[PDB]
mmCIF file of N, CA and C in Angstrom:
data_model
loop_
_atom_site.group_PDB
_atom_site.id
_atom_site.type_symbol
_atom_site.label_atom_id
_atom_site.label_comp_id
_atom_site.label_asym_id
_atom_site.label_seq_id
_atom_site.Cartn_x
_atom_site.Cartn_y
_atom_site.Cartn_z
ATOM 1 N N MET A 1 -7.746 253.574 25.096
ATOM 2 C CA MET A 1 -6.974 252.414 24.792
ATOM 3 C C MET A 1 -6.249 252.142 26.244
ATOM 4 N N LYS A 2 -5.004 251.900 26.136
ATOM 5 C CA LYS A 2 -4.015 252.137 27.279
ATOM 6 C C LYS A 2 -4.315 253.441 27.907
ATOM 7 N N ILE A 3 -4.238 253.289 29.566
ATOM 8 C CA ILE A 3 -4.573 254.717 29.975
ATOM 9 C C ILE A 3 -3.331 254.516 31.604
ATOM 10 N N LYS A 4 -2.863 255.493 31.973
ATOM 11 C CA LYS A 4 -2.136 255.507 33.085
ATOM 12 C C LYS A 4 -2.702 256.253 34.227
ATOM 13 N N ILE A 5 -2.285 255.496 35.254
ATOM 14 C CA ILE A 5 -3.054 255.702 36.883
ATOM 15 C C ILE A 5 -2.167 255.998 37.653
ATOM 16 N N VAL A 6 -2.015 257.094 38.421
ATOM 17 C CA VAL A 6 -0.921 257.593 39.743
ATOM 18 C C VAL A 6 -1.390 257.497 41.240
ATOM 19 N N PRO A 7 -1.972 256.410 41.694
ATOM 20 C CA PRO A 7 -2.083 256.278 42.917
ATOM 21 C C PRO A 7 -1.221 256.750 44.517
ATOM 22 N N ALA A 8 -1.252 257.658 44.683
ATOM 23 C CA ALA A 8 -0.775 258.579 45.788
ATOM 24 C C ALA A 8 -0.554 257.742 47.489
ATOM 25 N N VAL A 9 -0.473 256.538 47.029
ATOM 26 C CA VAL A 9 -0.427 255.219 48.550
ATOM 27 C C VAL A 9 1.029 254.562 48.317
ATOM 28 N N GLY A 10 1.565 254.185 49.415
ATOM 29 C CA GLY A 10 2.646 252.962 49.268
ATOM 30 C C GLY A 10 3.868 253.511 48.381
ATOM 31 N N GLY A 11 4.429 254.474 48.861
ATOM 32 C CA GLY A 11 5.069 254.860 47.387
ATOM 33 C C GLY A 11 4.758 254.957 46.201
ATOM 34 N N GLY A 12 4.087 256.112 46.104
ATOM 35 C CA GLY A 12 2.897 256.030 44.454
ATOM 36 C C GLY A 12 3.688 256.421 43.218
ATOM 37 N N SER A 13 3.267 255.545 42.156
ATOM 38 C CA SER A 13 4.214 255.785 41.125
ATOM 39 C C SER A 13 3.293 255.530 39.606
ATOM 40 N N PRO A 14 3.195 255.872 38.416
ATOM 41 C CA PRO A 14 2.813 255.862 37.391
ATOM 42 C C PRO A 14 2.629 254.288 37.079
ATOM 43 N N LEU A 15 1.514 254.027 36.492
ATOM 44 C CA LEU A 15 1.324 252.500 36.289
ATOM 45 C C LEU A 15 0.098 252.571 34.900
ATOM 46 N N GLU A 16 0.909 252.167 33.979
ATOM 47 C CA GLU A 16 -0.199 251.358 32.574
ATOM 48 C C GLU A 16 -1.152 250.319 32.811
ATOM 49 N N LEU A 17 -2.270 250.432 32.123
ATOM 50 C CA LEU A 17 -3.288 249.480 31.940
ATOM 51 C C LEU A 17 -4.035 249.486 30.719
ATOM 52 N N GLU A 18 -4.234 248.409 30.053
ATOM 53 C CA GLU A 18 -5.371 248.537 28.787
ATOM 54 C C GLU A 18 -6.692 248.346 29.554
ATOM 55 N N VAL A 19 -7.615 249.598 28.897
ATOM 56 C CA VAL A 19 -9.178 249.422 29.387
ATOM 57 C C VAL A 19 -10.106 249.397 28.303
ATOM 58 N N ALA A 20 -11.203 249.248 28.562
ATOM 59 C CA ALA A 20 -12.547 248.865 27.452
ATOM 60 C C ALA A 20 -12.972 250.491 27.104
ATOM 61 N N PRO A 21 -13.342 250.777 25.966
ATOM 62 C CA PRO A 21 -14.100 251.963 25.118
ATOM 63 C C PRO A 21 -15.184 252.642 26.010
ATOM 64 N N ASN A 22 -15.931 251.661 26.777
ATOM 65 C CA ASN A 22 -17.025 252.218 27.506
ATOM 66 C C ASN A 22 -16.627 252.342 28.837
ATOM 67 N N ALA A 23 -15.468 252.744 29.517
ATOM 68 C CA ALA A 23 -14.626 252.962 30.599
ATOM 69 C C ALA A 23 -15.141 254.087 31.101
ATOM 70 N N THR A 24 -15.304 254.614 32.495
ATOM 71 C CA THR A 24 -15.698 255.865 32.870
ATOM 72 C C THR A 24 -15.117 256.520 33.893
ATOM 73 N N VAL A 25 -14.535 257.638 34.203
ATOM 74 C CA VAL A 25 -14.264 258.306 35.390
ATOM 75 C C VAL A 25 -14.789 257.905 36.735
ATOM 76 N N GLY A 26 -16.157 258.015 36.812
ATOM 77 C CA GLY A 26 -16.740 257.729 37.909
ATOM 78 C C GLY A 26 -16.783 256.824 38.648
ATOM 79 N N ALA A 27 -16.402 255.374 37.588
ATOM 80 C CA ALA A 27 -16.551 253.709 37.841
ATOM 81 C C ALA A 27 -15.304 253.780 38.409
ATOM 82 N N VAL A 28 -14.416 254.277 37.716
ATOM 83 C CA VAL A 28 -12.495 253.843 38.158
ATOM 84 C C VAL A 28 -12.808 254.535 39.777
ATOM 85 N N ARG A 29 -13.083 255.468 39.840
ATOM 86 C CA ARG A 29 -13.072 256.387 41.260
ATOM 87 C C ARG A 29 -14.331 255.740 42.493
ATOM 88 N N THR A 30 -15.359 255.037 42.046
ATOM 89 C CA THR A 30 -15.820 254.571 42.864
ATOM 90 C C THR A 30 -15.554 253.083 43.133
ATOM 91 N N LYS A 31 -14.636 252.276 42.020
ATOM 92 C CA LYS A 31 -14.080 250.934 42.708
ATOM 93 C C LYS A 31 -12.739 251.469 43.713
ATOM 94 N N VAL A 32 -12.084 252.706 43.542
ATOM 95 C CA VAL A 32 -10.847 252.634 44.233
ATOM 96 C C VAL A 32 -11.471 252.973 45.715
ATOM 97 N N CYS A 33 -12.749 253.904 46.085
ATOM 98 C CA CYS A 33 -13.157 254.436 47.318
ATOM 99 C C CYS A 33 -13.557 252.872 47.984
ATOM 100 N N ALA A 34 -14.375 251.868 47.061
ATOM 101 C CA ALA A 34 -14.797 250.716 47.715
ATOM 102 C C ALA A 34 -13.636 249.717 47.886
ATOM 103 N N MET A 35 -12.546 249.750 47.315
ATOM 104 C CA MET A 35 -11.386 248.879 47.585
ATOM 105 C C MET A 35 -10.179 249.381 48.593
ATOM 106 N N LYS A 36 -10.222 250.831 48.725
ATOM 107 C CA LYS A 36 -9.642 251.157 49.895
ATOM 108 C C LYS A 36 -10.696 251.248 51.445
ATOM 109 N N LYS A 37 -11.801 251.204 51.030
ATOM 110 C CA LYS A 37 -12.886 251.213 52.233
ATOM 111 C C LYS A 37 -12.929 252.532 52.671
ATOM 112 N N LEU A 38 -12.692 253.499 52.162
ATOM 113 C CA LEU A 38 -12.954 255.144 52.400
ATOM 114 C C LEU A 38 -14.010 256.273 51.744
ATOM 115 N N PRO A 39 -14.564 256.941 52.613
ATOM 116 C CA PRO A 39 -15.555 257.804 51.516
ATOM 117 C C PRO A 39 -14.918 258.867 50.668
ATOM 118 N N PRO A 40 -15.726 259.376 49.832
ATOM 119 C CA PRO A 40 -15.091 260.562 48.823
ATOM 120 C C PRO A 40 -14.848 261.856 49.415
ATOM 121 N N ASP A 41 -14.957 262.151 50.626
ATOM 122 C CA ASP A 41 -14.291 262.874 51.536
ATOM 123 C C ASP A 41 -12.689 262.843 51.528
ATOM 124 N N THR A 42 -12.078 261.465 51.763
ATOM 125 C CA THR A 42 -10.671 261.250 51.908
ATOM 126 C C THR A 42 -10.273 260.249 50.781
ATOM 127 N N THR A 43 -10.832 260.043 49.701
ATOM 128 C CA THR A 43 -10.159 259.630 48.700
ATOM 129 C C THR A 43 -10.850 259.774 47.322
ATOM 130 N N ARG A 44 -10.159 260.898 46.366
ATOM 131 C CA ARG A 44 -10.880 261.440 45.102
ATOM 132 C C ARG A 44 -9.948 261.071 44.137
ATOM 133 N N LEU A 45 -10.580 260.839 42.317
ATOM 134 C CA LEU A 45 -9.819 261.085 41.533
ATOM 135 C C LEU A 45 -9.669 262.156 40.626
ATOM 136 N N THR A 46 -8.818 262.444 39.844
ATOM 137 C CA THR A 46 -8.851 263.584 38.781
ATOM 138 C C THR A 46 -8.331 262.967 37.601
ATOM 139 N N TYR A 47 -8.646 263.966 36.480
ATOM 140 C CA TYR A 47 -8.527 263.768 35.164
ATOM 141 C C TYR A 47 -8.183 264.867 34.335
ATOM 142 N N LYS A 48 -6.730 264.609 33.697
ATOM 143 C CA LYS A 48 -6.268 266.365 32.936
ATOM 144 C C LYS A 48 -6.465 267.380 34.071
ATOM 145 N N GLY A 49 -6.006 267.162 35.152
ATOM 146 C CA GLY A 49 -6.189 268.316 36.324
ATOM 147 C C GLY A 49 -7.719 268.778 36.857
ATOM 148 N N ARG A 50 -9.028 268.321 36.225
ATOM 149 C CA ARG A 50 -10.258 268.300 36.434
ATOM 150 C C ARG A 50 -10.323 267.095 37.547
ATOM 151 N N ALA A 51 -11.614 267.724 38.428
ATOM 152 C CA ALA A 51 -12.849 266.445 38.948
ATOM 153 C C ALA A 51 -13.613 265.883 38.285
ATOM 154 N N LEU A 52 -13.522 264.755 37.537
ATOM 155 C CA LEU A 52 -14.729 264.478 36.662
ATOM 156 C C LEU A 52 -15.478 262.910 37.264
ATOM 157 N N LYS A 53 -16.246 262.695 36.783
ATOM 158 C CA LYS A 53 -17.331 261.608 37.544
ATOM 159 C C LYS A 53 -18.393 261.086 36.289
ATOM 160 N N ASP A 54 -19.098 261.911 35.975
ATOM 161 C CA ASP A 54 -20.470 261.592 35.113
ATOM 162 C C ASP A 54 -20.356 261.503 33.736
ATOM 163 N N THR A 55 -18.766 261.208 32.925
ATOM 164 C CA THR A 55 -18.702 260.864 31.736
ATOM 165 C C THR A 55 -19.462 260.044 30.690
ATOM 166 N N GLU A 56 -19.971 259.145 31.369
ATOM 167 C CA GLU A 56 -20.963 258.091 30.340
ATOM 168 C C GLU A 56 -19.813 257.015 29.756
ATOM 169 N N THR A 57 -19.605 257.441 28.832
ATOM 170 C CA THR A 57 -18.518 256.739 28.183
ATOM 171 C C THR A 57 -17.549 257.797 27.293
ATOM 172 N N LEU A 58 -16.029 257.269 27.267
ATOM 173 C CA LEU A 58 -15.196 258.448 26.734
ATOM 174 C C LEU A 58 -15.384 258.337 24.995
ATOM 175 N N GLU A 59 -15.920 257.228 24.520
ATOM 176 C CA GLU A 59 -15.571 256.717 22.858
ATOM 177 C C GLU A 59 -16.873 257.457 22.422
ATOM 178 N N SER A 60 -17.879 257.711 22.926
ATOM 179 C CA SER A 60 -18.908 258.732 22.667
ATOM 180 C C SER A 60 -18.476 260.237 21.917
ATOM 181 N N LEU A 61 -17.657 260.660 22.655
ATOM 182 C CA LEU A 61 -16.930 262.204 22.516
ATOM 183 C C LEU A 61 -15.283 261.625 21.593
ATOM 184 N N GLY A 62 -14.604 260.813 21.993
ATOM 185 C CA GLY A 62 -13.288 260.565 21.577
ATOM 186 C C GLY A 62 -12.518 259.714 22.402
ATOM 187 N N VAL A 63 -12.450 258.244 22.380
ATOM 188 C CA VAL A 63 -11.323 257.642 23.422
ATOM 189 C C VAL A 63 -9.866 257.737 22.729
ATOM 190 N N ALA A 64 -8.931 258.024 23.421
ATOM 191 C CA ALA A 64 -7.646 257.916 23.033
ATOM 192 C C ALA A 64 -6.439 256.787 23.671
ATOM 193 N N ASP A 65 -5.205 256.846 23.042
ATOM 194 C CA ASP A 65 -4.076 256.133 23.827
ATOM 195 C C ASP A 65 -2.982 257.199 25.172
ATOM 196 N N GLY A 66 -2.744 256.840 26.173
ATOM 197 C CA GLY A 66 -2.151 257.444 27.273
ATOM 198 C C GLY A 66 -2.718 258.833 28.076
ATOM 199 N N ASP A 67 -4.095 258.551 28.130
ATOM 200 C CA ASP A 67 -4.543 259.284 29.169
ATOM 201 C C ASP A 67 -4.327 259.504 30.465
ATOM 202 N N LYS A 68 -4.256 260.079 31.192
ATOM 203 C CA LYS A 68 -3.384 260.223 32.856
ATOM 204 C C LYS A 68 -4.751 260.219 33.629
ATOM 205 N N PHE A 69 -4.701 259.948 34.844
ATOM 206 C CA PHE A 69 -5.657 259.721 35.930
ATOM 207 C C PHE A 69 -4.748 259.842 37.616
ATOM 208 N N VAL A 70 -4.923 260.375 38.131
ATOM 209 C CA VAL A 70 -4.298 260.895 39.565
ATOM 210 C C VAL A 70 -5.369 260.511 40.640
ATOM 211 N N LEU A 71 -4.902 260.221 41.530
ATOM 212 C CA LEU A 71 -5.945 258.988 42.645
ATOM 213 C C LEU A 71 -5.135 259.615 44.171
ATOM 214 N N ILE A 72 -5.953 260.136 44.722
ATOM 215 C CA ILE A 72 -5.605 261.074 45.875
ATOM 216 C C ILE A 72 -6.261 260.522 47.147
ATOM 217 N N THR A 73 -5.286 260.122 48.308
ATOM 218 C CA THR A 73 -5.766 259.822 49.222
ATOM 219 C C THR A 73 -5.515 260.589 51.091
ATOM 220 N N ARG A 74 -6.260 260.504 51.722
ATOM 221 C CA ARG A 74 -5.960 260.964 53.323
ATOM 222 C C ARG A 74 -5.927 260.064 54.183
ATOM 223 N N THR A 75 -5.615 260.184 55.284
ATOM 224 C CA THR A 75 -5.245 259.232 56.584
ATOM 225 C C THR A 75 -4.952 260.078 57.763
ATOM 226 N N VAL A 76 -5.290 259.687 59.103
ATOM 227 C CA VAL A 76 -5.230 260.371 60.237
ATOM 228 C C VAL A 76 -4.508 259.407 61.437
ATOM 229 N N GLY A 77 -3.753 259.712 62.071
ATOM 230 C CA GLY A 77 -3.464 258.660 63.393
ATOM 231 C C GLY A 77 -2.586 259.570 64.578
#
């Protein structure tokens, strides 16, 4: 239904958004890696404290309201 995301960049804070029942943790991760233009060594997603990607669909097991995602990033200068 609605989900929350916590990107650890630019003064990171939680944000709500509505998503499709066919959404997938790996597809959320790869969109952010592509949008940040950074490899999976320096940008990663977590869900319920686990690393996840190969979920295929949440709705085939049981999709819900208020599920929460944390997106971690790295940089050097």
